[PDB]
Design an enzyme around this catalytic site. Structure first.
Site, short mmCIF file in Angstrom:
data_model
loop_
_atom_site.label_atom_id
_atom_site.label_comp_id
_atom_site.label_asym_id
_atom_site.label_seq_id
_atom_site.Cartn_x
_atom_site.Cartn_y
_atom_site.Cartn_z
N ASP B 107 0.82 -1.21 0.00
CA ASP B 107 0.00 0.00 0.00
C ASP B 107 0.85 1.25 0.00
O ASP B 107 0.43 2.28 -0.54
CB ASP B 107 -0.86 0.07 1.26
CG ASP B 107 -2.00 -0.91 1.27
OD1 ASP B 107 -2.13 -1.75 0.35
OD2 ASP B 107 -2.81 -0.81 2.21
N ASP B 191 -2.13 5.40 -3.36
CA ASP B 191 -1.62 4.23 -2.64
C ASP B 191 -0.81 3.50 -3.69
O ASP B 191 -1.27 3.37 -4.83
CB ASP B 191 -2.77 3.32 -2.16
CG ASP B 191 -3.36 3.77 -0.82
OD1 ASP B 191 -3.19 4.94 -0.42
OD2 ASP B 191 -4.02 2.93 -0.18
N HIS B 240 -6.90 0.00 -4.45
CA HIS B 240 -5.91 -1.01 -4.81
C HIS B 240 -6.40 -1.85 -5.97
O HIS B 240 -7.60 -2.12 -6.10
CB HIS B 240 -5.52 -1.88 -3.61
CG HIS B 240 -5.16 -1.09 -2.39
ND1 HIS B 240 -5.36 -1.56 -1.11
CD2 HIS B 240 -4.62 0.15 -2.26
CE1 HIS B 240 -4.97 -0.65 -0.25
NE2 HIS B 240 -4.51 0.40 -0.90
N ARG B 259 -15.10 -7.64 -11.70
CA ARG B 259 -14.60 -6.30 -12.01
C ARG B 259 -13.92 -6.31 -13.36
O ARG B 259 -12.71 -6.18 -13.45
CB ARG B 259 -13.62 -5.85 -10.95
CG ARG B 259 -14.21 -5.94 -9.59
CD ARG B 259 -13.23 -5.63 -8.51
NE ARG B 259 -13.90 -5.83 -7.24
CZ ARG B 259 -13.35 -6.36 -6.15
NH1 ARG B 259 -12.08 -6.76 -6.16
NH2 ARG B 259 -14.10 -6.55 -5.07
#
EC number: 2.1.4.1
Lengths: 360, 360
Positions: B107, B191, B240, B259
């Site tokens: 991250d 991130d 992310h 997705r």
């Protein structure tokens, strides 16, 4: 029932399109040698067991994806086999080998009516090829389709003439003429691609990978509803019939000028139109690891008036065009290197139509 | 130079693995709300500022220690961040907050070549997160590595839409589609985990924590040697990309079925193999405070043929196995609750290999 296809031209609704992924060069054994051009023997000799050139595979993946896009645009439902690493070395009590690929569904699956048949194959590197298509087939089975697997050969040494006297494709043509092939009649074996469908009549050729016992099994299995016929050609393709005698419509056939059919008169008598395609323009420098330049005539019919033909092969495009058939040009020049064209890279699962005779 | 990693699959030699110790529940502010499931909102509302359940933390510590043991067995040098009490309340001239944890090095740190880059972050509770990794980074710097810290945001109210109309993850998906996120374009923020590496091409997504300004900073900073690309997905992960589009090899990518990538065709054209993983089997009763069930696809590649995958996720284990990739099963079911899987819990510092293009 999702499965239903009696011939090669009725309105296509569903198809299975192969994969170029993880394609592996087959070990150089006698049957591989008898089914490839001399020019490539040292390639097989050195690369056997490794993957086909990945830079080449990458281009084929792209070409085939585009082909799938075009099919979906033309309203066809596309299914693809599972991704599998073909480099795995397996061992049966009869032999040990690495695999090939699942690029050509036409080599292994054939659909006759509501029945999907898995061919036994004749190459050791293609023994476990069916593993890539089982997810699809089980789905069709759950949905009502009939499922058949022809007797899987042991593929023991007795199935091969380990001493097949072939030093060039010229020798092989001579032997084939004498009725001598690399495969014996030890047990049934065949590639589904040596059979081409025309409703109630199916045509086959005894080839380097399809023996008389294999054809007999098909004949005995499909009778009385279908009649399997054996036809022969001059200087035949070592394996598969779809780039030698491609049936494109009710009574129309593309007869490869270099491989004339010995029984052509049976077709002339039936009132069939024999069309001889113009020569391929593919560059001789382009690698064709399997098959030949005649992949140009390995077309796929979306219906009687729509053909998926190679974007590069302009001369055969014109021929279809003068005949009133809409050409859907797709480029698969790198995919060709693996051994097939549109008919080879697919298996028509469903075509809108009925069972009929066209031989009268 | 100890630092050297151009992608996600070359032979791993060194990695940084996070810590679950003293993990603290972030105060319930607008950006936390926009990055978590409704089911957990009252958890954040009540527990904010206290430690995550210590009984749960204790199990995660154990799981991660085992993971480190396995990495060392696989020949990877493991570094861990410093232990820090994340409950400390700090105050900048713009805000006041308690911290989160240093569980996910992915991250905050990204390695491009010989350069280690610290991301700015977009969450107030993660403002001073870099403090846990400085001992490691200074060591690499003393040993020749390049060290970069992207511009730390002020994280003033102007960076957030304090009125982001989200009442469910369903609303958020709709807004995201409209191009509306909880973070404005007030200043750069991001991130590192919203970027995934493939040699000369890096892919990123504008997300709830990574804005266009942040991506532009990366793009401008890494050019001309690297090209940062922006890709998008349907119903994207709030933050992310590594459990949505995980690149596992030269031209192979795991695309999360839920997705789908809007630019998938760019990849098909490149001859890339898009693999869609099977669904997660993790129990819906198991708490996932952040992230989703798709952590199953958040795998870590030790090399092209070795993947560290969850011991419980048998279906995805089989998929890798049919592809010829050795699965190294490790159970991190409790560690998952913190928000990450193997890719999230690590930062590959060194992979044996060179800079290349895979998009041709």
């Amino acid at each position: 029932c999702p499965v239903s296809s009696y011939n090669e031209w009725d309105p296509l609704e569903e198809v299975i399109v192969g994969r170029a992924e993880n394609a592996c060069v087959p070990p150089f054994t006698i049957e591989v040698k008898a089914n490839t051009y001399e020019k490539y023997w040292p390639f097989y000799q050195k690369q056997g067991g490794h993957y086909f050139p990945k830079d080449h595979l990458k281009k084929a993946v792209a070409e085939i994806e585009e082909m799938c896009n075009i099919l979906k645009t033309e309203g066809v439902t596309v299914r693809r086999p599972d991704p599998i690493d073909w480099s795995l070395k397996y061992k049966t009590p009869d032999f040990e080998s690495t695999g090939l690929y699942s690029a050509m569904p036409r080599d292994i699956l054939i659909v006759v009516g509501n029945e999907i048949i898995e061919a036994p194959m004749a190459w050791r590197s293609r023994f476990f090829e069916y593993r890539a298509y089982r997810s699809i087939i089980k789905d069709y089975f759950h949905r009502g389709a009939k499922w058949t697997t022809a007797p899987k050969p042991t593929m023991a040494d007795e199935l091969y003439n380990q001493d097949y006297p072939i030093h060039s494709v010229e020798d092989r043509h001579k032997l084939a003429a004498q009725g001598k092939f690399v495969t014996t009649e030890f047990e049934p074996c065949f590639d589904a691609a040596d059979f081409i469908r025309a409703g109630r009549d199916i045509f086959a050729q005894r080839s380097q990978v399809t023996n008389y016992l294999g054809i007999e099994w098909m004949r005995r299995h499909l009778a009385p509803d279908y009649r399997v016929h054996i036809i022969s050609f001059k200087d035949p393709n070592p394996m598969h019939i779809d780039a030698t005698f491609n049936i494109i419509g009710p009574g129309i056939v593309l007869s490869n000028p270099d491989r004339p059919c010995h029984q052509i008169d049976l077709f002339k008598k039936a009132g069939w139109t024999i069309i001889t395609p113009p020569t391929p323009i593919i560059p001789d420098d382009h690698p064709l690891w399997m098959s030949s330049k005649w992949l140009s005539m390995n077309v796929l019919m979306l219906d009687e008036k729509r053909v998926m033909v190679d974007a590069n092969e302009v001369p055969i495009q014109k021929m279809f065009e003068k005949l009133g058939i809409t050409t859907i040009k797709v480029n698969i020049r790198n995919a060709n290197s693996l051994g097939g064209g549109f008919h080879c890279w697919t298996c028509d699962v469903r075509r809108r139509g009925t069972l009929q005779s066209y031989l009268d």
